[PDB]
Design an enzyme around this catalytic site. Structure first.
Site, PDB file in Angstrom:
ATOM      1  N   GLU A  35       8.999 -25.905 -80.622  1.00 30.44           N
ATOM      2  CA  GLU A  35       8.623 -27.269 -80.215  1.00 30.44           C
ATOM      3  C   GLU A  35       7.196 -27.306 -79.675  1.00 30.44           C
ATOM      4  O   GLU A  35       6.463 -28.216 -79.981  1.00 30.44           O
ATOM      5  CB  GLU A  35       9.647 -27.783 -79.219  1.00 30.44           C
ATOM      6  CG  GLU A  35      11.017 -28.150 -79.782  1.00 30.44           C
ATOM      7  CD  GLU A  35      11.109 -29.358 -80.708  1.00 30.44           C
ATOM      8  OE1 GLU A  35      10.076 -30.020 -80.821  1.00 30.44           O
ATOM      9  OE2 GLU A  35      12.109 -29.518 -81.418  1.00 30.44           O
ATOM     10  N   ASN A  46       4.690 -39.713 -82.331  1.00 32.54           N
ATOM     11  CA  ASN A  46       5.554 -39.994 -83.480  1.00 32.54           C
ATOM     12  C   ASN A  46       5.092 -41.259 -84.187  1.00 32.54           C
ATOM     13  O   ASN A  46       4.488 -42.127 -83.593  1.00 32.54           O
ATOM     14  CB  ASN A  46       7.007 -40.118 -83.013  1.00 32.54           C
ATOM     15  CG  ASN A  46       7.412 -38.847 -82.287  1.00 32.54           C
ATOM     16  OD1 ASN A  46       7.825 -38.820 -81.126  1.00 32.54           O
ATOM     17  ND2 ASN A  46       7.294 -37.755 -82.965  1.00 32.54           N
ATOM     18  N   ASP A  48       6.867 -43.814 -84.806  1.00 29.40           N
ATOM     19  CA  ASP A  48       7.469 -44.977 -84.159  1.00 29.40           C
ATOM     20  C   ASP A  48       6.692 -45.418 -82.926  1.00 29.40           C
ATOM     21  O   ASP A  48       7.106 -46.389 -82.308  1.00 29.40           O
ATOM     22  CB  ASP A  48       8.947 -44.781 -83.831  1.00 29.40           C
ATOM     23  CG  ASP A  48       9.277 -43.737 -82.765  1.00 29.40           C
ATOM     24  OD1 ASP A  48       8.352 -43.141 -82.184  1.00 29.40           O
ATOM     25  OD2 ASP A  48      10.435 -43.498 -82.500  1.00 29.40           O
ATOM     26  N   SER A  50       6.484 -43.591 -80.147  1.00 30.30           N
ATOM     27  CA  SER A  50       6.942 -42.804 -79.045  1.00 30.30           C
ATOM     28  C   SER A  50       6.090 -41.506 -79.009  1.00 30.30           C
ATOM     29  O   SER A  50       5.408 -41.200 -79.967  1.00 30.30           O
ATOM     30  CB  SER A  50       8.400 -42.473 -79.169  1.00 30.30           C
ATOM     31  OG  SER A  50       8.601 -41.673 -80.328  1.00 30.30           O
ATOM     32  N   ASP A  52       6.358 -37.214 -77.721  1.00 32.26           N
ATOM     33  CA  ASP A  52       7.108 -36.086 -77.234  1.00 32.26           C
ATOM     34  C   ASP A  52       6.280 -35.226 -76.268  1.00 32.26           C
ATOM     35  O   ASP A  52       5.084 -35.019 -76.457  1.00 32.26           O
ATOM     36  CB  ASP A  52       7.414 -35.227 -78.429  1.00 32.26           C
ATOM     37  CG  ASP A  52       8.357 -35.882 -79.425  1.00 32.26           C
ATOM     38  OD1 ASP A  52       9.083 -36.779 -79.087  1.00 32.26           O
ATOM     39  OD2 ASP A  52       8.441 -35.419 -80.481  1.00 32.26           O
ATOM     40  N   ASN A  59      11.359 -36.887 -75.822  1.00 33.03           N
ATOM     41  CA  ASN A  59      10.834 -38.085 -76.470  1.00 33.03           C
ATOM     42  C   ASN A  59      10.878 -39.283 -75.511  1.00 33.03           C
ATOM     43  O   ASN A  59      11.835 -39.481 -74.750  1.00 33.03           O
ATOM     44  CB  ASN A  59      11.633 -38.294 -77.756  1.00 33.03           C
ATOM     45  CG  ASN A  59      11.077 -39.487 -78.474  1.00 33.03           C
ATOM     46  OD1 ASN A  59      11.556 -40.612 -78.332  1.00 33.03           O
ATOM     47  ND2 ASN A  59       9.994 -39.279 -79.148  1.00 33.03           N
ATOM     48  N   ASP A 101      24.516 -34.955 -74.786  1.00 31.23           N
ATOM     49  CA  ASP A 101      24.545 -36.348 -75.232  1.00 31.23           C
ATOM     50  C   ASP A 101      25.477 -36.514 -76.431  1.00 31.23           C
ATOM     51  O   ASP A 101      25.786 -37.636 -76.836  1.00 31.23           O
ATOM     52  CB  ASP A 101      23.156 -36.856 -75.591  1.00 31.23           C
ATOM     53  CG  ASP A 101      23.037 -38.354 -75.835  1.00 31.23           C
ATOM     54  OD1 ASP A 101      23.362 -39.120 -74.908  1.00 31.23           O
ATOM     55  OD2 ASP A 101      22.593 -38.742 -76.940  1.00 31.23           O
TER      56      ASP A 101
END
Ligand code: NA
Length: 129
Positions: A35, A46, A48, A50, A52, A59, A101
């Site tokens: 990562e 990203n 979108d 967003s 990270d 995120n 989650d």
């Protein structure tokens, strides 16, 4: 901070990640490697909108607030900048919420594509833990 492999293994172990929800420490070290390359200051944007953040590339759409990701949940209740600290406490505590989650570590695309089903014990070999 850029961690060494064993140094991070030891910090993650101290923060209760070894076998957390069944994922051995090697999984967590592998995921951090691919990562962030073990760099707490890593950010990546990203498509979108967003971003990270941090060693585990958490995120901003769901997990932290960065002030620029419209209609984002801030489920870890933290500014995303807290994730870039040399102290990994916040990243770890948020990661525990993510992994709980329901999709486990598949939430981390580099884990899924580069760690999952590999010999992840190799990531902690040699380390004093
Ligand atoms: Na957010």
């Amino acid at each position: 901070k850029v961690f060494g492999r064993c140094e991070l293994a030891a910090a993650m172990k101290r923060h209760g990640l070894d076998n957390y929800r069944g994922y051995s420490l090697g999984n967590w070290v592998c995921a951090a490697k691919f990562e962030s390359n073990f760099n707490t200051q890593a950010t990546n944007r990203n498509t979108d909108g967003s971003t990270d953040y941090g060693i585990l590339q958490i995120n901003s759409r769901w997990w932290c607030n960065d002030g620029r990701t419209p209609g984002s949940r801030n489920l870890c209740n933290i500014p995303c900048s807290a994730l870039l600290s040399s102290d990994i406490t916040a990243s770890v505590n948020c990661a525990k919420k993510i992994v709980s989650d329901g999709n486990g570590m598949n939430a981390w695309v580099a884990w899924r594509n580069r760690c999952k089903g590999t010999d992840v014990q190799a990531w902690i070999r040699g380390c004093r833990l």
